[PDB]
């Protein structure tokens, strides 16, 4: 009814321990969503063109030319870790569990309130907000996944992370087809390369509308819309990292001489010469069996061509890399490729009382040792004389193509049938939870943006829009814009995400690295005297696991 | 039989998760115990007298005069935390659980081996060790608790903490009655005070023997002795600490002025004068309602007379204190009373390859804020004029009895019917697990040495002794010592301690302090290149809990 | 005591013992508290000095109330300023029932 | 408990009342050395800060289910049942000088 | 701290830290909420335990 | 019956000084409003509460 | 548990005493003095009073 509520606020996460060390995690989340009427009631087709920026030779990485369809609908997106967990629940899950399953997902909309602004133009020009009890909110649930899938976590435009703060939805848009061609150059190149935007191929035109595809529900004040329960079928995401490289697989060599005194410089020693040892190598012309030459079962990780831009029908793009380097060799100073860098605003983890429009940034360096250190690689000739000569090695200090800043590791690629690698780790709080698999014949082995991939079907997207509120003067045969009453809405969203985890067990004599609070990160978890909150990122794969 | 084994080595700890968030922890432990034949086969009554040490005036804290009965039996004692858990299992229990129950306890002895040394006196004088298949080992289990209860963890004489290292049992002894009287003095006292050892009261003489009290089992090589399962009935031991003092109980005052800018120096302010506020105090002649004067429901902790030696029938002793101070005010520099100090050797956590006979020491500072800071206490007159006068306060800088190093906090005592306090926390690895309740009419509310107190009955003590191996020449009517064959033994001990714990839950937005490994304590959990191991102490009450 | 003429030994005296008998606190009309919560500690106090009844295992839960946010048309969560709301208040009726 | 700050509901049934703005204590560390009037120098009057081992930040939203009430709505707590010792309405007069 | 900076006034300490929440509390834990002086006179004069 | 407590005794701890609570104070023929005592509570309140 | 005696008497008499063969600052056990290495019979921790 008019003065009857249709739902209940709930933002609790529960832990229900089953038998055999399985625990059912059910995270609830509720928000207050503020929605304005759209700027235009029509679908647009806008072409973005920053050709003045890439007209300077060398700046071809800054390309932004694309085409998109601007729709009057808005999207409610809750596909991020920080929507469902606070740092206490995340510390509990990360420290106590070993693997994670994704079970189900629901959402609903209740307690709709529509108000109209009537700006009484005084000399202090005021505005009185009145309830419009007969206005409607239009809600479309794309359960068959007919619309193009747009995850909002990649643009940092999901729901907010604080339960006591009102949030906004994202204006929806999708990509339209275009053709462009950009020839690269460098600073000090004679002439201008081709920088051409061709247009649209008629064989690839797809124009989607919400009205022709999805049934749209009209919600007044006493109405309530509830999505049913979707059920996932996914692979488990493991909360442990591996440390073993190719240099630490299998049986170590037997030491015939052990140290007799304590110290960091009392080393052990194999008492056999390198040309008198036993074991298997893969060098048919070499009697040396060392730690770098001994045969391993497979290879962990691979080398990829890093900072490689590939061009296609719609312009250049960067090549994605599955796992980057990180650990004792690389810091914030030592720049690497493969580690993602997140940017976000005050709604998603930045300090709420900060000044300026510069976002907050961090680079996520994972714990799994599956990367490569490109400054220590080399090729050598198959003759394999051990004091190697100048013209028999390919070093990373040798120029490729005459360019002194390019070596062979920039174009190297060692992916093969012996390559083993790991899935991507979850990133709290800004990371995505699930993702959709590509509708192609040969599917990729992993995604670099989400730990779960719903294979057959994913949860349908939820669209929302304020219904048009017309005035007395309205002529559809006139070419001008539709004149509407200034209306906005407030509704309550409530979701429920259910997981399933397994409690970890101790295997070693020594303790394990855990997530804790100390004197350094103390004031990152409490509000300030004004109420400024923030959410700093936390690691997810803390405990180690033996690979082999 | 002779060539048949009678048991299985087991040193695994299991975690069996039940329903409703309860987990059954079952710790197994196994050792190899090395036992020699006793020095004498008789019971002795030895009186220890260090009267030359306390003959100097002022050293009366160094009293060691007592009397004891030296028995030829040895004790197998496994009442310590480090016998049952490694640091990985302790990290799991401390980080994941909230309370701890003690359920049952078993032990057994198997695979007995008795050998005789026959020293063939050559010029390199050798010794050949021969199996004596008909020798016996005597095992007595005092299941009715007839012998006096002696816990070996208070003298650091339990079993070892490493499963791959052979251990020894403790030679048993108990206290005999004596009477002594020592009058204290100081350096520069005219004359000598009374330093007299009187003797034994005949009303209090108790001489216990193992043979007249306990049935003794004789074990040959094919024999095996197994204690049954004892079942505890105890209160649960909680793995969370409290932080709330008397200054943080109840509703805070309402602030009429909040800060407008961020900073450590933008304070809030109650906008009411101290003589115009509302609330309840306990001062009938004072209109001031401040944070120190406002009525609280009860009192947390108490003041005790610290470093107070009390004298009785058998000499002076220190007064035990339940909870000492510790935290932001006290460090290793700022000495305190109430916090225990442990000393131990290479078998119990010291570095195994260290040099010297100086033991390893640490002071255990707990996390629970239930102590007192004696430098900030004061008494004042009941007239309560607020700028207080010199002769109306009792300060800790005022001398008591004319002594400049003694103030009133050394003789103060504020235990009352309003005092609330907490049980003692477990100390890993050197701390005791269970303790026996006193057989008196009015029992103490807690013990300062063990978190569990078995009230009605405790597990019985296990005594062990090599049976006498006589030679051909033996005359009992001759006053000389019995001549025996030099014999020793090796047997395997195996115990099983079962607990019950409850998994913790998250309640706050912020994370909780956990136990972790880092770059500082990294090499405390791995062996060295010689095999030197150590066990450093770990805290047990890490998470906080609201008191009120 | 200690050379101070305004302090005697009764200010530092304490004669609580195992022979001490004493009474519970009396109710104070009208300003006094009715019930109180027991401390969640291992060794609990024998009485409280502020309420005659102490609910030992559990006490009645507290009741919190708040007016829901009433936003205007201009609202930007990415702006560091304060949320602008419509000035709202409430009136409700409370009704309790205590049985002795 | 709000009775210790004199901030409960009103005592007259025919008079409108207000509720109390909620707040709780956060952890801090401070140290104050006492003195008297006419003491040479200044004692230590230091506010240290917060211990990270004792930080507890509670919110209503993450802990309690919150009901939304419009005009036609009504919220009713169930019946809680106490288990307490009886409070006696008689006093004792006998000292140690009047026993036996 | 300006109040307790004068020597001798250390009973007037008010330094603490608190969390200020936007919620309000309905508290009816007092004797005067439930009884008028007539009912209190009846209970006090006629009864012995409660 | 009853006990003696250290009266107007301020104890200090981690978070500052506080007064020691006393269970029962004196009162009767010897003590009046003039004769100040310790243990008896003192209430302050406003127009809403009496 | 009493302390272990490393030297027992060899003759009978009221003045043939035993002796702990460890110095007072070299013994093991639990005390309640955080600033003292001496473990004597008056300093050693007892369960209650």
UniProtKB/Swiss-Prot annotation, chain C:
<comment type="subunit">
    <text>Interacts with host TFRC.</text>
</comment>
<comment type="similarity">
    <text>Belongs to the parvoviridae capsid protein family.</text>
</comment>
<comment type="function">
    <text>Capsid protein self-assembles to form an icosahedral capsid with a T=1 symmetry, about 22 nm in diameter, and consisting of 60 copies of two size variants of the capsid proteins, VP1 and VP2, which differ by the presence of an N-terminal extension in the minor protein VP1. The capsid encapsulates the genomic ssDNA. Capsid proteins are responsible for the attachment to host cell receptor TFRC. This attachment induces virion internalization predominantly through clathrin-endocytosis.</text>
</comment>
<feature type="disulfide bond">
    <location>
        <begin position="55"/>
        <end position="59"/>
    </location>
</feature>
<protein>
    <recommendedName>
        <fullName>Capsid protein VP1</fullName>
    </recommendedName>
</protein>
Curated annotation (Swiss-Prot), chain D:
<comment type="function">
    <text>Capsid protein self-assembles to form an icosahedral capsid with a T=1 symmetry, about 22 nm in diameter, and consisting of 60 copies of two size variants of the capsid proteins, VP1 and VP2, which differ by the presence of an N-terminal extension in the minor protein VP1. The capsid encapsulates the genomic ssDNA. Capsid proteins are responsible for the attachment to host cell receptor TFRC. This attachment induces virion internalization predominantly through clathrin-endocytosis.</text>
</comment>
<protein>
    <recommendedName>
        <fullName>Capsid protein VP1</fullName>
    </recommendedName>
</protein>
<comment type="similarity">
    <text>Belongs to the parvoviridae capsid protein family.</text>
</comment>
<comment type="subunit">
    <text>Interacts with host TFRC.</text>
</comment>
UniProtKB/Swiss-Prot annotation, chain F:
<comment type="subunit">
    <text>Interacts with host TFRC.</text>
</comment>
<comment type="similarity">
    <text>Belongs to the parvoviridae capsid protein family.</text>
</comment>
<protein>
    <recommendedName>
        <fullName>Capsid protein VP1</fullName>
    </recommendedName>
</protein>
<comment type="function">
    <text>Capsid protein self-assembles to form an icosahedral capsid with a T=1 symmetry, about 22 nm in diameter, and consisting of 60 copies of two size variants of the capsid proteins, VP1 and VP2, which differ by the presence of an N-terminal extension in the minor protein VP1. The capsid encapsulates the genomic ssDNA. Capsid proteins are responsible for the attachment to host cell receptor TFRC. This attachment induces virion internalization predominantly through clathrin-endocytosis.</text>
</comment>
């Amino acid at each position: 009814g008019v003065g009857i509520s249709t739902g209940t606020f709930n933002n609790q996460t529960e832990f229900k321990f089953l038998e055999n060390g399985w625990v059912e995690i059910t995270a609830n989340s509720s928000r207050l969503v503020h929605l304005n009427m759209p700027e235009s009631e029509n679908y647009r087709r806008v072409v973005v063109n920053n050709m003045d920026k890439t007209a300077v030779n060398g700046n071809m990485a800054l390309d932004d030319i694309h085409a998109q369809i601007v729709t009057p609908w808005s999207l409610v997106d809750a596909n991020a870790w920080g929507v469902w967990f606070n740092p206490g629940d995340w510390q509990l899950i990360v420290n106590t569990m070993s693997e994670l399953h994704l079970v189900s997902f629901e959402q609903e909309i209740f307690n709709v309130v529509l108000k109209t602004v009537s700006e009484s133009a005084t000399q202090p020009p005021t505005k009185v907000y009145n309830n419009d009890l007969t206005a409607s909110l239009m809600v479309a649930l794309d359960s068959n996944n007919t619309m193009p899938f747009t995850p909002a976590a990649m643009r940092s435009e999901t729901l907010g992370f604080y339960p006591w703060k009102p949030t906004i939805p994202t204006p929806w848009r999708y990509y339209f087809q275009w053709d462009r061609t950009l020839i690269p150059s460098h600073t000090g190149t004679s002439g201008t390369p081709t920088n051409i935007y061709h247009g649209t191929d008629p064989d690839d035109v797809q124009f989607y509308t919400i009205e022709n595809s999805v049934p749209v529900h009209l919600l007044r004040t006493g109405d309530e819309f509830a999505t049913g329960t979707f059920f996932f079928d996914c692979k488990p995401c493991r909360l442990t990292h591996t440390w073993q490289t190719n240099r630490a697989l299998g049986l170590p060599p037997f030491l015939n001489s052990l140290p007799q005194s304590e110290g960091a410089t009392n080393f052990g020693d194999i008492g056999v010469q390198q040309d008198k040892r036993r074991g298997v190598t893969q060098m048919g012309n070499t009697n040396y069996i060392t730690e770098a030459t001994i045969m391993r079962p497979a290879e962990v990780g691979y080398s990829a061509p890093y900072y490689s831009f590939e061009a296609s029908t719609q312009g250049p793009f960067k090549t994605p890399i599955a796992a980057g380097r990180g650990g004792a060799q690389t810091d914030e100073n030592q720049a690497a490729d493969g580690n993602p860098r997140y940017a976000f605003g005050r709604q998603h983890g930045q300090k709420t009382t900060t000044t300026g429009e510069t976002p907050e940034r961090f680079t996520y360096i994972a714990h799994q040792d599956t990367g490569r250190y490109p400054e220590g690689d080399w090729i050598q000739n198959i003759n394999f004389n051990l004091p190697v000569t100048n013209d028999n090695v390919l070093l990373p200090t040798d120029p490729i193509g005459g360019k002194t800043g390019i070596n062979y590791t920039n174009i190297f690629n060692t992916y093969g049938p012996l390559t083993a690698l790991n899935n991507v780790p979850p990133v709290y709080p800004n990371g995505q939870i699930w993702d959709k698999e590509f509708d192609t014949d040969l599917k990729p082995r992993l995604h670099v943006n989400a730990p779960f991939v719903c294979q057959n079907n994913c949860p349908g997207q939820l669209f929302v829009k304020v219904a048009p509120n017309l005035t007395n003067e309205y002529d559809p045969d006139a070419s001008a814009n539709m004149s509407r009453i200034v209306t906005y809405s407030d509704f309550w969203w409530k979701g429920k995400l259910v997981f399933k985890a397994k409690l970890r067990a101790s295997h070693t004599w020594n303790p394990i690295q855990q997530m804790s609070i100390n004197v350094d990160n103390q004031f990152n978890y409490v509000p300030s005297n004004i109420g400024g909150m923030k959410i700093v990122y936390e690691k997810s794969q803390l405990a180690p696991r033996k690979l082999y």
